[PDB]
Amino acid sequence: GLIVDTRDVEERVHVMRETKLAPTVAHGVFNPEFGPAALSNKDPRLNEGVVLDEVIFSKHKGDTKMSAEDKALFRRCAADYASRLHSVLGTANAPLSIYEAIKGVDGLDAMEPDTAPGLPWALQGKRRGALIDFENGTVGPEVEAALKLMEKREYKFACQTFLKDEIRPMEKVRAGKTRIVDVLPVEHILYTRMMIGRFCAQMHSNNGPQIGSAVGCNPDVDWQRFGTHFAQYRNVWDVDYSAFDANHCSDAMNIMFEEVFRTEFGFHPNAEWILKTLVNTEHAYENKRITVEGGMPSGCSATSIINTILNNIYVLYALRRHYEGVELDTYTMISYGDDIVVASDYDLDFEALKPHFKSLGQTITPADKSDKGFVLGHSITDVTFLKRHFHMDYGTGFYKPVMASKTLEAILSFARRGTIQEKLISVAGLAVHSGPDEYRRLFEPFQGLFEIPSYRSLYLRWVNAVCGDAAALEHHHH
Numbered sequence: 293g294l295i296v297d298t299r300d301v302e303e304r305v306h307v308m309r310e311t312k313l314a315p316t317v318a319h320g321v322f323n324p325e326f327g328p329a330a331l332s333n334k335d336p337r338l339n340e341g342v343v344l345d346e347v348i349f350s351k352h353k354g355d356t357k358m359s360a361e362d363k364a365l366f367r368r369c370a371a372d373y374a375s376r377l378h379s380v381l382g383t384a385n386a387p388l389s390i391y392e393a394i395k396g397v398d399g400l401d402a403m404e405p406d407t408a409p410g411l412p413w414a415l416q417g418k419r420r421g422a423l424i425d426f427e428n429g430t431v432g433p434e435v436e437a438a439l440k441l442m443e444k445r446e447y448k449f450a451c452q453t454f455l456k457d458e459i460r461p462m463e464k465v466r467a468g469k470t471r472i473v474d475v476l477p478v479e480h481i482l483y484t485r486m487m488i489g490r491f492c493a494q495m496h497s498n499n500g501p502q503i504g505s506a507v508g509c510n511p512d513v514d515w516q517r518f519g520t521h522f523a524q525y526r527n528v529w530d531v532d533y534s535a536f537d538a539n540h541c542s543d544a545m546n547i548m549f550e551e552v553f554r555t556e557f558g559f560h561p562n563a564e565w566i567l568k569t570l571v572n573t574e575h576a577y578e579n580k581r582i583t584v585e586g587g588m589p590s591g592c593s594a595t596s597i598i599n600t601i602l603n604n605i606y607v608l609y610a611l612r613r614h615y616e617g618v619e620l621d622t623y624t625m626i627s628y629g630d631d632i633v634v635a636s637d638y639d640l641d642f643e644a645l646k647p648h649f650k651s652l653g654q655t656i657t658p659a660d661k662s663d664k665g666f667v668l669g670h671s672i673t674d675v676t677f678l679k680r681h682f683h684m685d686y687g688t689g690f691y692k693p694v695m696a697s698k699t700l701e702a703i704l705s706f707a708r709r710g711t712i713q714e715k716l717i718s719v720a721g722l723a724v725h726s727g728p729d730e731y732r733r734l735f736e737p738f739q740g741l742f743e744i745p746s747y748r749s750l751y752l753r754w755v756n757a758v759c760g761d762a763a764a765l766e767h768h769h770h
């Protein structure tokens with residue numbers, strides 16, 4: 293994004309906090325090169341010269357204005373992807389009711405009752421529950437008023453910069469690279485869900501290579517589906533971006549919103565409008581108000597879907613900008629936000645695509661260090677996706693999502709107080725695919741103090757999850 297204005301105002305929107313994460317018993321055993329992100333400039337771990345807001349907004353180094361020709365190409369790619377998307381999902385894209393937007397529907401989680409309400413409510417000491425009845429799925433007069441402004445396209449708002457309390461590599465922690473959540477007003481999230489939540493629900497339910505989206509997938513179940521699909525192709529590329537969300541140019545965002553969320557695909561006219569309010573945004577950090585043109589705000593509602601859609605269009609765009617005769621069946625891919633796996637039988641020169649991604653303001657690099665850039669010949673078993681490898685389970689012959697042990701060690705080394713038992717059961721679901729020896733080793737520090745699921749129990753759970761028929765078939769003989 294391009295920072296076009298910065299000004300100081302009277303109202304100080306607080307951003308500095310103390311971490312809720314503490315080391316666990318596993319920290320002393322694994323000693324990970326990971327720690328809680330700095331949530332304050334006074335944090336002693338920070339390097340000299342580090343000012344949080346400067347580092348946080350340093351990713352905004354311009355809004356790439358695409359040529360007329362490139363925008364035309366982009367719109368064709370956006371429309372072609374949209375065509376695939378709405379062919380698979382259908383056109384049942386009318387607004388959710390206020391009740392449905394709050395309470396959720398099949399394939400769309402309910403709204404969080406006690407997360408940050410955003411501005412100006414945070415400054416007024418009003419929590420989300422003061423504005424919305426999450427039990428009954430109704431809204432108070434303030435939100436009702438705001439919804440009318442959105443209906444009339446007169447609604448304006450500021451985003452609240454919220455520091456992400458999370459574990460990061462210590463290199464990034466000390467550099468002040470604390471990630472953020474751009475907290476939009478609760479009514480904006482509500483209306484966005486009203487406008488495109490039905491579409492988002494359908495995206496989740498139809499996740500896969502066909503629509504190029506893994507959003508709403510269950511890695512336990514879907515690694516078999518994804519792994520088997522990508523194993524059929526000669527080439528598989530693990531592509532990485534740098535600041536994917538920040539570098540979405542306004543042209544790309546606008547054109548995507550225009551082609552994907554058209555009224556002819558069942559959307560209300562304000563679906564495009566409310567999405568377009570994400571393009572030029574004002575961000576509150578303490579007394580500073582920073583206006584950014586371009587880039588996707590780091591939200592938690594429709595952000596992953598939007599980023600996933602753009603990722604799909606980018607690949608089509610880049611390939612078509614370099615090669616002639618490129619269509620959606622020239623390659624295959626799946627994406628979750630910035631994360632992406634691409635495959636094709638064609639020897640696609642991904643190194644040569646670099647400048648074409650650059651015309652979108654995006655910088656692509658291979659997942660591995662840089663073996664003289666991108667290369668052909670890699671398979672599904674070489675790549676990572678959602679921090680998970682595609683490994684073959686010897687017991688079943690199904691693909692399983694295997695996380696690196698150092699990742700799991702880092703995850704296990706920290707936790708929010710009072711949540712550890714819950715976290716361990718969750719992480720056990722991730723760790724089971726590493727095998728019984730590694731599973732045992734990872735949870736050994738917690739044995740006795742907490743209930744650790746048996747490897748056996750999680751393996752059997754997984755077998756049925758990935759293939760119920762296989763689980764059944766194993767009981768045919770004594």
Ligand SMILES: [Mn+2]
Pocket residue numbers: 530531532631632659676677
């Ligand atoms: Mn990657």
